[model samples]
Target: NAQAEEFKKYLETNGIKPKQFHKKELIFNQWDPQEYCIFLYDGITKLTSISENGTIMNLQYYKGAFVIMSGFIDTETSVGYYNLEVISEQATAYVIKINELKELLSKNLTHFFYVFQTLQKQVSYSLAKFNDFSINGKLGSICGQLLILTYVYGKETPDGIKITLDNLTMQELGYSSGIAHSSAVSRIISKLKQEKVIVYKNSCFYVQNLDYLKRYGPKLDEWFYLACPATWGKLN
Candidate 1:
């Protein structure tokens, strides 16, 4: 992640608020789209949106990247989702006016190659790729998303790779996976849980058998290579 560190340092030199909290010490709020953008330095953020039907659009995760607030980024395939809420601690971000973001990019020759390299990395790209993964289908899609969450944010231990997803529920998993129905997502989860492929209790997520889960193929394969950090070296 050498290239990543360089990009982070680039932002650290130009940004403010190295850490932004959620709901409490957070600088931004829901439905509050400003004339600015966020350049994430480190740590993960949880994004959320709500539908008129009260359906939840759950953002899986993000670490180290810059996100343009609004554009043609809608890949949700439906109208239920609305207004993105991004908040993560330890996320170093440059909160500049939208025009300033572009202005600064022009002046950084030292980061000319470095910036694009880091942006092309999984951080921002992963979210965009979710569209393709979503098309991959119900079962593998959500599972792959979970795999990435665990890989990026999971805690490693003797028992297994443990991932905590307090914000995501079965329903949002469905939306993100193209399942779109909590009932169906529940079935997908049930199948994995039944066979002891995954371990979930009290909102905590764990994968005891990475081998078994990989057999799903479709989305996991894509995420496995793209989302797993190079720093992990060879994943067992």
Candidate 2:
């Protein structure tokens, strides 16, 4: 995500109080009252939906400066509809009362535009993921997700791009890709690793072949462009 230090300063100047959160902390519950909306100034958080059978699916991952509005502010009511869990060791965010922000938003069209654009990108990414699952099947969906995650949380080295998300597991990868079973996810990982498409080292994934991941779908680039709005005009 692009830097939003100015937005953070704006909020701070407006007297919005900043809060600190720790890893694995539940920032907001699914049914909590939407008293305030949080703007993440630093660190990562995930929006998740859990099934009655305890199967969890990750809806979105917000890193850096981003607004936590997908669950906090709903179209229908002032109640959250998703669980926001902090994933970074320590995170900083500014909290603004829902009503107060509503008024403040009306006064600041720049922030309003920023919010609308960010939210639209979120929806676009969701639809793009659904489209990938429909067109590329389960394995392709997983690859597409891995590509997207790498784009967001990867580090570059001589060999490949290494995913830096701490404590990332097969179960979390499966959940992020809309799969329920880690065994199934591991099967694909095993095949990809054997083929040198990726490598699992130090409990993290290193994508060895980017083009191999893209081979799963003829239009993976298009879906990826949609999933990552920042790459809209950058893709071939």
Candidate 3:
């Protein structure tokens, strides 16, 4: 994938550039000829769209270590303008030219398909935990749990193992999980804090004890099974 290689070089070239926006900052009414064609080279970019009435629709999210978006597709234009919000503090992306991306997509259709499949799997796996908790409580709890477990068990990065409660506002949580934001997650976290299962300090959350988290922490797998039994089999 030449596009991937080009994207890597682009990152290596601009590794020291300062970001124009901070994490979770909104970019509104900005116009760029090179819009939808984005490459997440170092961080996680979450693309959201807001309607004229201030309703936010989450279009997509991407993490680095690969190219995120190839080019703008017509289907993505329904939300008027797109909001490129940073999810990670130290992540960077490359905005690629559409012509170069189009050529790459044409020449390596198989690679594109494989990338698409991987993305689909990632999204599916992420959403699987939300099935059971869609209607009842704490949509953010599941998301937070999933994020924590993904890092702890799957990715094995324990350096900064803390969750920021304020970092995820109710609206942002709703946008991320496609659920009613309200006090769902906050309420759940309150209960966990009271029980000393989790601790929130310095605007970040830490599972005081991993054994405690595993034994009595929220069970995201149970929620997944309740939400989509058929697809639940795919989960590990």
| Model 3: lowest-lDDT 10 consecutive positions | 148-157
* Model 1: colliding residue pairs: none
Q: Order of candidates by TM-score, top first?
A: 2, 1, 3
For each candidate in turn, the TM-score is 0.70, 0.87, 0.57
What candidate 1 gets wrong by more than 4 Å, as runs, is 1-19, 23-32, 48-54, 65-92, 122-136, 178-181, 217-220, 223-234
Best-fitting candidate, scored by lDDT: 2
What does candidate 3's lDDT look like per residue over 1-236, in tens digits?
45455545543464423234457764333344233455556666666766667677555555554444434544433224566777666565555544445555566566566556555645664564443345334434444443434332232125334653335554565665555555765665677678665555576555554444333324445443453344344323
Candidate 2 residue pairs in clash (backbone atoms < 3 Å): none
TM-score of 3: 0.57
How high is the lDDT of residue 76 in model 1?
16
lDDT of 2 by residue, 146-236 (tens): 8677767777777678888888888888888888898999998889898899887777788888777666643545655654546434323
Q: Compared with the true structure, what per-residue lDDT tens digits does model 1 show for residues 1-236?
A: 56556656666677544655453133343455454455555545655655667665655545655453432222312223234344443445556555555656678776655545544654545654564465556676766666556656667766667775555667657756656678888888888889787777557777777766555443444545654546234445
Model 2 scores worst on lDDT over the 10 consecutive residues at: 70-79
